[PDB]
Amino acid sequence: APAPFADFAPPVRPQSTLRRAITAAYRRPETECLPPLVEAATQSKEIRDAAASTARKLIEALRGKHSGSGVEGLVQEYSLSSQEGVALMCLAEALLRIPDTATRDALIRDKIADGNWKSHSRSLFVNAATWGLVVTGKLTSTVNDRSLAAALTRLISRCGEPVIRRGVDMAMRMMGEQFVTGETIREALKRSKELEEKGFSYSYDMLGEAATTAADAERYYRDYESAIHAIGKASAGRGIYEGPGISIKLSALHPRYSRAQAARVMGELLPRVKALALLAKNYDIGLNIDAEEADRLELSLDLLEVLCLDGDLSGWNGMGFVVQAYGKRCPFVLDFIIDLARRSGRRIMVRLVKGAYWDAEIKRAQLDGLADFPVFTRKIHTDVSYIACAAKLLAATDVVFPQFATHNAQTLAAIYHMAGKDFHVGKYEFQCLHGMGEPLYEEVVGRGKLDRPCRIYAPVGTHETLLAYLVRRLLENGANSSFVHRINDPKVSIDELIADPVEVVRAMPVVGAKHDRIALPAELFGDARTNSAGLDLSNEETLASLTEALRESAAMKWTALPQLATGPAAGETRTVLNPGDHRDVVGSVTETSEEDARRAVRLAADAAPDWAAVPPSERAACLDRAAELMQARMPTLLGLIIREAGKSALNAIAEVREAIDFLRYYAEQTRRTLGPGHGPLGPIVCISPWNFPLAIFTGQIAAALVAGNPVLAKPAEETPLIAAEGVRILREAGIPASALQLLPGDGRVGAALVAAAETAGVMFTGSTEVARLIQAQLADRLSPAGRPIPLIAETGGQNAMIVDSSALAEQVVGDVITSAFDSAGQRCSALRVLCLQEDVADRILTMLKGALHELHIGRTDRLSVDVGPVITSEAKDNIEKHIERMRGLGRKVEQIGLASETGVGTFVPPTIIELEKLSDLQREVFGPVLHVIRYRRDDLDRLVDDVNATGYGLTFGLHTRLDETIAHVTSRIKAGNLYINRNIIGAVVGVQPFGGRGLSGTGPKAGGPLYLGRLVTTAPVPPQHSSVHTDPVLLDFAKWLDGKGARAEAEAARNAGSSSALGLDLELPGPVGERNLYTLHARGRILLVPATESGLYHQLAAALATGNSVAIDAASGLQASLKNLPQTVGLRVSWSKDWAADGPFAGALVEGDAERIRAVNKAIAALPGPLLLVQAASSGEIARNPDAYCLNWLVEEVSASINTAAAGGNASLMAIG
Amino acid sequence: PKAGGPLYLGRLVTTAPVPPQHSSVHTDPVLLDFAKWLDGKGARAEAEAARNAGSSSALGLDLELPGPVGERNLYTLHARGRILLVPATESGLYHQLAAALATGNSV
Amino acid sequence: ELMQARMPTLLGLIIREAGKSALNAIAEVREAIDFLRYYAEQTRRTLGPGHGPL
Ligand SMILES: [C]C1=C([C])[C]=C2C(=[C]1)N([C][C]([O])[C]([O])[C]([O])[C]OP([O])(=O)OP([O])(=O)O[C][C]1O[C](N3[C]=NC4=C3N=[C]N=C4[N])[C]([O])[C]1[O])C1=NC(=O)[N]C(=O)C1=N2[C]1[C][N][C](C([O])=O)S1
Ligand SMILES: NC(=O)c1ccc[n+]([C@@H]2O[C@H](COP(=O)([O-])OP(=O)(O)OC[C@H]3O[C@@H](n4cnc5c(N)ncnc54)[C@H](O)[C@@H]3O)[C@@H](O)[C@H]2O)c1
Ligand SMILES: [Mg+2]
């Protein structure tokens, strides 16, 4: 048996001093990075004056020949609005998908120009965000396809065939000659002769990146290989400086290019790069490795090292490598490369760029809760870094070949004068992007200008392949801080453009301060609370320290005991085994007798006043202290979760982060709300699931505790050890032993706790079937006041994602792989049903199956493991029984092979099952099993019906670029957590408050602002909880009441209309590149069980004020109290003689004495389907208490998370520099 | 239609143009249910007409118009109310219903 | 353009023929000018050969 974590994440090679200095700078504070760069970038006053003069001269020439763009002239000629211009370019794009020129022209002349363009599976406007950048310079993340359709109809009906003709010719020019140098390498090489004769050179980019499958990587490989032949044939011995070369992206050459898969990268990717480099060597052309995301930088250095030390490549100086000056590690990376060039004797071609992925790096660091960014946050810092690194490169031209890739004339001029008077071809060069840089460098290349060479980075590919690179390009030119945007801005003077970034930074009061408008990840929530911190699993120091802490966690003797108020109790003891390897004993659990569980409830009851008397601020301080303890102990907590619950390190980090976030969120919500009149319920039984064994465990207990309730904590029988450690942490944080008792054991302990007479409330997260048993237990019970015992029951999902033909397959597949198979599908939020529009289903399914087979399944104490085990052999048997049933029905089943090592544990391979109809599913299958259905676009509304028809309502995803489809689907889906253009497993506390409806939950949502109010007898007013909107049917009912003479009830109805928070619509603070929305909706149809006329009027007012319809108990005999209702109200009112037939309901209001309430509660619990959140009151309570029925529980919370960076960049961050 | 607004000129020609900014991303939910019902009955041309009406309807348009500072001048498209339908044929009635339901109206 | 340039004279007629004050006569002429320019622009944004007159 392998020792735990003995092979967790060993580095590719021992880290040299130079490599370690790189890693040390990864997230260095910005104020520490800049001073050395300012020193390195300093030049003499004479040079700065000469540079400014050169830069002014370049900028004056640039602005002098600056003519209007072709699209701008087209917009002008036909008086097009922006939407018309965008719609026209979308139409032209589509017409160019028609290959035959004569066929296209007939369609234009005879069909398109004559009105109905719509007549002639894929929205015309799928790429409108890109064309929007071209036309307007601004990025709109999604497409208003109804606005574009209207604009296209309007412009065609107004201007006819001539404007279509001009649009097509424009689009043809741009997509064939401006965004790419050519469609094919042969075409690009032909078009390169003109500028080569003027002194330019070329580096061709075949536009591959981010392989998703093995087949993708093979395709990109043979594309590079075939391009190298064509370029090498064309080079014809010109060599690596005068002649053309190629650029490659490592992400194109392997589907798992990541530090987590470093062994696969070195074993499988490296030989492919070597083979391409050997061919480049034989033709003697340059081969450049493009720089990509920050978490790939250091990994790529291991390939660069091996290649430069490989004797088979000796004699060739064409190996090239990009370094990104916006990165804090850039100068240290250059030190490493220069030293490698010295050791290997290879004159490495070093392309210095600023960096292409800035927005994405900001979002990723925020999402991951890391200490700082790996890039600068002020644009001028990148400029100083660039010039500092150019000085380092220019001092090493004997050993490297510097290549200064920039379109900034100030940057260029500074380096031109820095390099001095001695020049020869091969000393260094400049570089520019095809299309973007020729105006500037025609003022540089040639003995009549600055007589310095420029290599053009030349994209090559079809219209289809060009999109990703294009948005990344167009977003760059649109940012306010970009040189290209500023030189075109008339309000920007040449003096401002030639301003020296080195001197500007040097004179700042605080050198190198972070941007004021970009939050560090820790500060995402500002003054409200401190964000939890994650760990960077791409950082070798982190991996090394985590390796030791994980190993140490595996040597600990973890135990879980019945921790009663009086001290640990005796019981039956057994071992806890690693689900991924039953030979790995993780610890020992002593489980609770039903006698001791009943005793613990009595002890909690006796201790309840002492805990309620701890002021809310001090209870919240305990939570905050507990959060600090968990943050400090995260590495050890990771190791325990990894081994006890079969989680990967990434998932365990998120798990501990979520626990920390619960603690801090409920602490802050407490400080915002709880006062003397919000009395605790009493002893609360917290029953938690195995699959989030720390986070949900902690969240329920922390909420109950901070609301002033003593807690009986019953963890899932599978995962008691992490629960015991969380209880130890909470107790260390100051929660008294009498306020928090741990009762390990199975459902018998849970049931004994629920049944205990003093149990005042139950918080349950788990399966719907178990919640239903607890609901039945509680229906026997009333509080001492004669009211139902509150139950929060957060249960299963049957979560769908709908994908239309506008979505990007690579994005979809990544989000599907994560949503369906992360944690082996053992997330309640996990994707269960993928719904694919028929026209794209085959392509996406092929890509999905290819991605499936790149997953590594195994024991999770290895960083390379993607998917761990299922929790037990019983879970495995249950999942496999489902798979084989489906397989028996003839459904296509895709499964990846499991290594023999999995036999010592309980594993189910990630599985894809292709279904015919959504009704082929019957129950939640809690494992790594994705079902796929196809749908025709016209049946989208029916498909949403089908998703809703399961009765679940937890998470839901939609991948589309089209606003009409977003509006349609999100208005018709009924689920508590929605996700647009991203995965569906985000439940960030306070950002996506988490929890569903129907069979998925009673609410209120964990991690949201209504949660604590359920755990006290009188609910406070949550922060931000109000609405200016009044339900109109409530208003009509209040008027009807006044017309009937029921004046007091009409007043109560109007008060309910005002007090309702129906229509609340908020955006919650969170990471950049995401919009996180929180809204209060009607729950649905509320069952009303009245006893008196006034009671019925109050119940109806409460239900209508919160947007609901009602079914009124016909056995009340109160039909005559509701005669002659307004039609608006009658539409919402039905009478029910058979409650079971008229559901599902979404809640209930009950009026009666205590035994009437108990009887109705039993009848309601017997209704099929969803657990109902029931509120009961006596007639006298209704008369005395306007809040007898609390409106908090008559609305439904909906969280929506929209990935606004999905189009390829972040519009908000484009204005930040 | 309103004088001084974008629907006005279209009343004075035999085929109305699409006015500037005249669109909506919202689809009437009753229109959607009607299209599905027509689908179920096999009235494929009418169901297509219903879907097309649902998309081209500008019901729900909600714009701020340019004007003076210190004012917000808003322009919105709502249902008219109850529309009198005088059909002659079943297909005609389905088409009338599609047009009226797509624009939020009762009939 | 003509109504704008002749607004003072048009004001005088409106004041005496229709009982308007100077301020309201100014508003009257401005609105006429705005109708003219608005329907002109709306025409430039929309009308094509298939939008036949009544
Ligand atoms: C020219 C070139 C070549 C030849 C090649 C390459 C490149 C380039 N790239 C790109 C770069 O990086 C950049 O992005 C551009 O170029 C731009 O820059 P320039 O011209 O310099 O401009 P300016 O304006 O001066 O600047 C801009 C910049 O800055 C920065 N920022 C912004 N904002 C900010 C910043 N920082 C800080 N903070 C703040 N706030 C940024 O950076 C921007 O951009 C590249 N890149 C990369 O990454 N890599 C590579 O490799 C490269 N190359 C190419 C290839 N790839 C790419 C793609 O694909 O896309 S391109
Ligand atoms: N809605 C959410 O937020 C959410 C979150 C996580 C998990 N879940 C659901 O949880 C399920 C998986 O977790 P699980 O396997 O641990 O759920 P489970 O229903 O099997 O058990 C959950 C807890 O209930 C206890 N239990 C079992 N029988 C009981 C009884 N008769 N009375 C009282 N307690 C009893 C168990 O000991 C455990 O502590 C999945 O259905 C998943 O969807 C929901
Ligand atoms: Mg269970």
CSV table of C-alpha atoms in Angstrom, one decimal, chain A residues 670-974:
chain,number,residue,atom,x,y,z
A,670,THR,CA,-25.7,38.2,13.0
A,671,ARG,CA,-24.0,41.6,13.6
A,672,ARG,CA,-26.4,43.1,11.1
A,673,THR,CA,-29.6,41.7,12.5
A,674,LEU,CA,-29.9,39.9,15.8
A,675,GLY,CA,-31.3,41.7,18.9
A,676,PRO,CA,-33.0,41.0,22.1
A,677,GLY,CA,-36.4,40.2,20.6
A,678,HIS,CA,-35.1,37.6,18.2
A,679,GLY,CA,-35.2,34.7,20.6
A,680,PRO,CA,-33.6,31.4,19.8
A,681,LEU,CA,-35.7,28.4,19.1
A,682,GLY,CA,-33.9,26.1,21.6
A,683,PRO,CA,-32.0,22.9,20.9
A,684,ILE,CA,-31.4,22.5,17.2
A,685,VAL,CA,-30.6,19.2,15.6
A,686,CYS,CA,-28.1,19.6,12.8
A,687,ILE,CA,-27.9,16.6,10.5
A,688,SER,CA,-25.4,16.8,7.7
A,689,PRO,CA,-24.4,14.8,4.5
A,690,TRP,CA,-21.2,13.0,3.8
A,691,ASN,CA,-20.3,14.8,0.6
A,692,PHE,CA,-19.5,18.2,2.0
A,693,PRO,CA,-18.4,16.9,5.3
A,694,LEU,CA,-16.9,20.1,6.7
A,695,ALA,CA,-18.6,22.9,4.8
A,696,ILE,CA,-22.3,22.0,5.2
A,697,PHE,CA,-21.6,20.5,8.6
A,698,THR,CA,-20.1,23.8,9.7
A,699,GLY,CA,-22.6,26.0,8.0
A,700,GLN,CA,-25.7,24.5,9.7
A,701,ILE,CA,-24.1,24.4,13.1
A,702,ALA,CA,-22.6,27.9,12.9
A,703,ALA,CA,-25.9,29.4,11.9
A,704,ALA,CA,-27.9,27.7,14.7
A,705,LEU,CA,-25.2,28.6,17.3
A,706,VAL,CA,-24.9,32.2,16.3
A,707,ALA,CA,-28.7,32.5,16.4
A,708,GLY,CA,-28.4,31.6,20.1
A,709,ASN,CA,-29.4,27.9,19.9
A,710,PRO,CA,-27.5,25.0,21.4
A,711,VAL,CA,-26.7,22.4,18.8
A,712,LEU,CA,-26.7,18.7,18.5
A,713,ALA,CA,-24.4,18.0,15.6
A,714,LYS,CA,-25.0,14.6,13.9
A,715,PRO,CA,-22.5,14.1,11.1
A,716,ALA,CA,-23.0,11.6,8.3
A,717,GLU,CA,-21.8,8.2,9.4
A,718,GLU,CA,-19.3,8.1,6.5
A,719,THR,CA,-17.4,11.3,7.5
A,720,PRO,CA,-17.3,11.7,11.3
A,721,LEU,CA,-13.6,12.6,11.6
A,722,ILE,CA,-13.6,16.0,9.9
A,723,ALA,CA,-16.8,16.8,11.7
A,724,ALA,CA,-15.2,16.1,15.1
A,725,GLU,CA,-12.3,18.3,14.1
A,726,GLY,CA,-14.7,21.1,13.1
A,727,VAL,CA,-16.4,20.7,16.5
A,728,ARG,CA,-13.0,20.8,18.2
A,729,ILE,CA,-12.2,24.1,16.3
A,730,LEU,CA,-15.5,25.6,17.2
A,731,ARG,CA,-15.0,24.7,20.9
A,732,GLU,CA,-11.5,26.1,20.8
A,733,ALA,CA,-13.0,29.3,19.3
A,734,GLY,CA,-15.2,29.6,22.5
A,735,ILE,CA,-18.4,27.7,21.8
A,736,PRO,CA,-19.1,26.1,25.1
A,737,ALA,CA,-19.3,22.3,25.3
A,738,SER,CA,-22.9,22.6,26.4
A,739,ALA,CA,-23.8,24.6,23.3
A,740,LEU,CA,-22.2,22.2,20.8
A,741,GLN,CA,-22.4,18.4,21.3
A,742,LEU,CA,-21.1,16.0,18.6
A,743,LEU,CA,-23.1,12.8,18.2
A,744,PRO,CA,-21.4,10.5,15.7
A,745,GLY,CA,-23.5,7.7,14.3
A,746,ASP,CA,-25.9,6.6,11.5
A,747,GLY,CA,-29.5,7.7,10.8
A,748,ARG,CA,-30.7,6.1,14.1
A,749,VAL,CA,-28.8,8.8,16.0
A,750,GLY,CA,-30.3,11.4,13.7
A,751,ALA,CA,-33.8,10.0,14.2
A,752,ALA,CA,-33.4,9.8,18.0
A,753,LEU,CA,-32.3,13.4,18.0
A,754,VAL,CA,-35.2,14.6,15.8
A,755,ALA,CA,-37.7,12.7,18.0
A,756,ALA,CA,-36.3,14.0,21.3
A,757,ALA,CA,-39.0,16.1,23.1
A,758,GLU,CA,-36.8,19.1,23.7
A,759,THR,CA,-35.7,19.4,20.0
A,760,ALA,CA,-36.9,22.8,18.9
A,761,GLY,CA,-35.7,22.9,15.3
A,762,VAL,CA,-34.1,20.6,12.7
A,763,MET,CA,-31.5,21.6,10.0
A,764,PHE,CA,-31.2,18.7,7.5
A,765,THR,CA,-29.1,18.5,4.4
A,766,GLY,CA,-29.3,15.1,2.6
A,767,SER,CA,-31.5,12.9,0.5
A,768,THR,CA,-35.1,13.9,-0.2
A,769,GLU,CA,-36.2,10.4,1.0
A,770,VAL,CA,-34.6,10.9,4.4
A,771,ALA,CA,-35.9,14.5,4.7
A,772,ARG,CA,-39.4,13.0,4.1
A,773,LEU,CA,-38.9,10.6,7.0
A,774,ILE,CA,-37.8,13.5,9.3
A,775,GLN,CA,-40.8,15.5,8.1
A,776,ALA,CA,-43.1,12.6,9.2
A,777,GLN,CA,-41.3,12.4,12.6
A,778,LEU,CA,-41.8,16.2,13.1
A,779,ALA,CA,-45.5,16.2,12.1
A,780,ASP,CA,-46.2,14.3,15.4
A,781,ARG,CA,-44.7,17.2,17.3
A,782,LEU,CA,-45.5,20.7,18.5
A,783,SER,CA,-43.4,23.2,20.3
A,784,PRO,CA,-44.4,24.0,23.9
A,785,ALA,CA,-46.2,27.0,22.4
A,786,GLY,CA,-48.2,24.6,20.2
A,787,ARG,CA,-46.6,25.4,16.9
A,788,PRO,CA,-44.7,23.2,14.3
A,789,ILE,CA,-41.0,22.5,14.9
A,790,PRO,CA,-39.1,24.4,12.1
A,791,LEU,CA,-37.4,22.2,9.6
A,792,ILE,CA,-34.9,23.3,7.0
A,793,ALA,CA,-34.5,20.4,4.6
A,794,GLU,CA,-32.1,21.0,1.7
A,795,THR,CA,-32.2,17.9,-0.5
A,796,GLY,CA,-31.4,16.4,-3.9
A,797,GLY,CA,-31.3,17.7,-7.4
A,798,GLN,CA,-31.8,16.5,-11.0
A,799,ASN,CA,-29.8,19.4,-12.4
A,800,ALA,CA,-29.9,20.2,-16.1
A,801,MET,CA,-27.7,22.4,-18.4
A,802,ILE,CA,-29.2,23.6,-21.7
A,803,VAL,CA,-26.7,24.3,-24.5
A,804,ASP,CA,-27.8,26.0,-27.8
A,805,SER,CA,-25.9,26.3,-31.0
A,806,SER,CA,-24.5,29.7,-30.1
A,807,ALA,CA,-22.4,28.3,-27.2
A,808,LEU,CA,-18.7,27.7,-27.6
A,809,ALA,CA,-18.1,23.9,-27.5
A,810,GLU,CA,-14.8,24.1,-25.7
A,811,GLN,CA,-16.3,26.3,-22.9
A,812,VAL,CA,-19.3,23.9,-22.7
A,813,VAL,CA,-17.2,20.8,-22.5
A,814,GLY,CA,-15.0,22.2,-19.7
A,815,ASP,CA,-18.0,23.3,-17.7
A,816,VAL,CA,-19.7,19.9,-18.2
A,817,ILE,CA,-16.7,17.9,-17.3
A,818,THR,CA,-16.3,19.9,-14.1
A,819,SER,CA,-20.0,20.0,-13.3
A,820,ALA,CA,-20.7,16.4,-13.9
A,821,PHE,CA,-17.6,14.6,-12.7
A,822,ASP,CA,-15.8,16.8,-10.2
A,823,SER,CA,-15.9,15.0,-6.9
A,824,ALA,CA,-17.2,11.9,-8.8
A,825,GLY,CA,-20.5,13.7,-9.3
A,826,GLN,CA,-21.0,13.7,-5.5
A,827,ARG,CA,-22.2,17.3,-5.3
A,828,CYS,CA,-25.8,18.0,-4.9
A,829,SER,CA,-25.3,20.7,-7.5
A,830,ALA,CA,-23.7,18.3,-10.0
A,831,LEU,CA,-24.8,18.3,-13.6
A,832,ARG,CA,-27.1,15.3,-14.2
A,833,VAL,CA,-28.7,16.0,-17.6
A,834,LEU,CA,-27.0,17.8,-20.4
A,835,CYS,CA,-29.4,19.1,-23.1
A,836,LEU,CA,-27.8,19.8,-26.4
A,837,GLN,CA,-29.4,21.6,-29.4
A,838,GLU,CA,-29.7,19.0,-32.1
A,839,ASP,CA,-27.5,20.8,-34.7
A,840,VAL,CA,-24.5,20.9,-32.3
A,841,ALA,CA,-25.1,17.8,-30.3
A,842,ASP,CA,-22.8,15.4,-32.2
A,843,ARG,CA,-19.8,17.8,-32.3
A,844,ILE,CA,-20.2,18.6,-28.6
A,845,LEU,CA,-20.7,14.9,-27.7
A,846,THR,CA,-17.6,13.9,-29.6
A,847,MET,CA,-15.6,16.6,-27.8
A,848,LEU,CA,-17.1,15.7,-24.4
A,849,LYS,CA,-16.2,12.0,-24.8
A,850,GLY,CA,-12.7,13.0,-25.8
A,851,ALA,CA,-12.4,15.1,-22.7
A,852,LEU,CA,-13.8,12.3,-20.6
A,853,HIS,CA,-11.0,10.0,-21.5
A,854,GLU,CA,-8.4,12.5,-20.3
A,855,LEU,CA,-9.6,12.3,-16.7
A,856,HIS,CA,-7.4,10.5,-14.1
A,857,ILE,CA,-9.4,8.4,-11.6
A,858,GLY,CA,-7.7,7.2,-8.5
A,859,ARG,CA,-6.9,7.6,-4.8
A,860,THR,CA,-6.9,11.3,-4.3
A,861,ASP,CA,-3.6,11.8,-2.4
A,862,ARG,CA,-2.0,12.6,-5.8
A,863,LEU,CA,-2.3,16.1,-7.5
A,864,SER,CA,-2.7,14.3,-10.8
A,865,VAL,CA,-6.0,12.7,-9.8
A,866,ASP,CA,-9.1,14.4,-11.2
A,867,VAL,CA,-11.8,12.1,-10.0
A,868,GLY,CA,-11.8,10.2,-6.7
A,869,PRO,CA,-13.8,7.3,-5.4
A,870,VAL,CA,-17.5,7.1,-4.5
A,871,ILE,CA,-18.0,7.2,-0.7
A,872,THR,CA,-19.0,3.5,-0.1
A,873,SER,CA,-19.5,0.2,-1.8
A,874,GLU,CA,-23.3,0.7,-1.3
A,875,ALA,CA,-23.1,4.0,-3.2
A,876,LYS,CA,-21.1,2.3,-5.9
A,877,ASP,CA,-23.6,-0.6,-6.2
A,878,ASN,CA,-26.5,1.9,-6.4
A,879,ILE,CA,-24.8,3.9,-9.1
A,880,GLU,CA,-23.7,0.8,-11.1
A,881,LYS,CA,-27.2,-0.6,-10.9
A,882,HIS,CA,-28.5,2.6,-12.6
A,883,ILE,CA,-25.8,2.5,-15.3
A,884,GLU,CA,-26.5,-1.2,-16.1
A,885,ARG,CA,-30.2,-0.6,-16.2
A,886,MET,CA,-29.7,2.2,-18.8
A,887,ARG,CA,-27.2,0.0,-20.7
A,888,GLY,CA,-29.8,-2.7,-20.7
A,889,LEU,CA,-32.3,-0.4,-22.3
A,890,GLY,CA,-29.9,0.0,-25.2
A,891,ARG,CA,-28.8,3.5,-24.2
A,892,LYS,CA,-25.3,4.4,-25.4
A,893,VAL,CA,-22.9,4.4,-22.4
A,894,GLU,CA,-19.4,5.9,-22.5
A,895,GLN,CA,-17.1,5.0,-19.6
A,896,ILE,CA,-13.4,5.5,-19.1
A,897,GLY,CA,-11.3,2.5,-18.0
A,898,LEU,CA,-10.3,2.3,-14.4
A,899,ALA,CA,-6.8,1.4,-13.4
A,900,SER,CA,-6.2,-1.8,-11.4
A,901,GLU,CA,-5.2,0.4,-8.4
A,902,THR,CA,-8.8,1.4,-7.9
A,903,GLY,CA,-9.7,-2.1,-6.8
A,904,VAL,CA,-8.6,-1.4,-3.2
A,905,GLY,CA,-11.3,1.3,-3.0
A,906,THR,CA,-14.8,2.0,-4.3
A,907,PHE,CA,-14.7,3.8,-7.7
A,908,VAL,CA,-17.2,4.3,-10.5
A,909,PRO,CA,-15.8,5.5,-13.8
A,910,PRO,CA,-17.1,8.8,-15.1
A,911,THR,CA,-20.0,7.8,-17.4
A,912,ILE,CA,-22.0,9.4,-20.2
A,913,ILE,CA,-25.4,8.0,-20.9
A,914,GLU,CA,-27.3,9.2,-24.0
A,915,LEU,CA,-31.1,9.3,-23.2
A,916,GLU,CA,-34.1,9.7,-25.5
A,917,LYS,CA,-36.4,11.7,-23.2
A,918,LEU,CA,-35.7,13.4,-19.9
A,919,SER,CA,-38.4,11.1,-18.3
A,920,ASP,CA,-35.9,8.2,-18.7
A,921,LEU,CA,-34.6,9.5,-15.4
A,922,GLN,CA,-36.5,8.6,-12.3
A,923,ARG,CA,-34.4,9.6,-9.2
A,924,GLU,CA,-31.2,11.5,-8.4
A,925,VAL,CA,-28.2,9.3,-9.1
A,926,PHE,CA,-25.5,10.6,-6.8
A,927,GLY,CA,-22.4,9.7,-8.8
A,928,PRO,CA,-20.3,10.5,-11.8
A,929,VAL,CA,-23.1,9.8,-14.3
A,930,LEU,CA,-23.9,12.4,-16.9
A,931,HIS,CA,-27.1,12.0,-19.0
A,932,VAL,CA,-27.3,13.6,-22.5
A,933,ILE,CA,-30.5,14.5,-24.3
A,934,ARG,CA,-30.9,16.4,-27.6
A,935,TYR,CA,-33.6,18.9,-28.5
A,936,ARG,CA,-34.7,20.9,-31.5
A,937,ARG,CA,-34.6,24.7,-31.0
A,938,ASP,CA,-38.3,25.1,-31.5
A,939,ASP,CA,-38.9,22.7,-28.6
A,940,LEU,CA,-36.8,24.8,-26.1
A,941,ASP,CA,-39.9,25.8,-24.1
A,942,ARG,CA,-41.1,22.2,-23.9
A,943,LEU,CA,-37.6,21.2,-22.8
A,944,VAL,CA,-37.7,23.7,-19.9
A,945,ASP,CA,-41.1,22.2,-19.0
A,946,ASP,CA,-39.4,18.7,-19.0
A,947,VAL,CA,-36.7,19.9,-16.7
A,948,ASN,CA,-39.2,21.5,-14.3
A,949,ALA,CA,-41.4,18.4,-14.5
A,950,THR,CA,-39.0,16.3,-12.5
A,951,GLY,CA,-40.1,18.2,-9.4
A,952,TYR,CA,-36.5,19.1,-8.5
A,953,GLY,CA,-35.2,22.6,-8.6
A,954,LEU,CA,-31.7,23.0,-7.3
A,955,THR,CA,-29.0,24.0,-9.9
A,956,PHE,CA,-29.5,24.8,-13.6
A,957,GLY,CA,-27.1,25.9,-16.3
A,958,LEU,CA,-27.6,27.7,-19.6
A,959,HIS,CA,-24.9,28.1,-22.2
A,960,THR,CA,-25.9,30.6,-24.9
A,961,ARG,CA,-24.8,34.0,-26.2
A,962,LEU,CA,-28.4,35.1,-27.1
A,963,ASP,CA,-30.3,37.5,-24.9
A,964,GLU,CA,-33.7,36.2,-26.1
A,965,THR,CA,-32.7,32.7,-25.1
A,966,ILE,CA,-31.4,33.9,-21.7
A,967,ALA,CA,-34.6,35.8,-21.0
A,968,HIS,CA,-36.8,32.9,-22.1
A,969,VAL,CA,-35.0,30.2,-20.3
A,970,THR,CA,-34.4,32.0,-17.0
A,971,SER,CA,-38.0,33.3,-16.8
A,972,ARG,CA,-39.4,29.8,-17.3
A,973,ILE,CA,-37.0,27.6,-15.4
A,974,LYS,CA,-37.9,26.9,-11.7
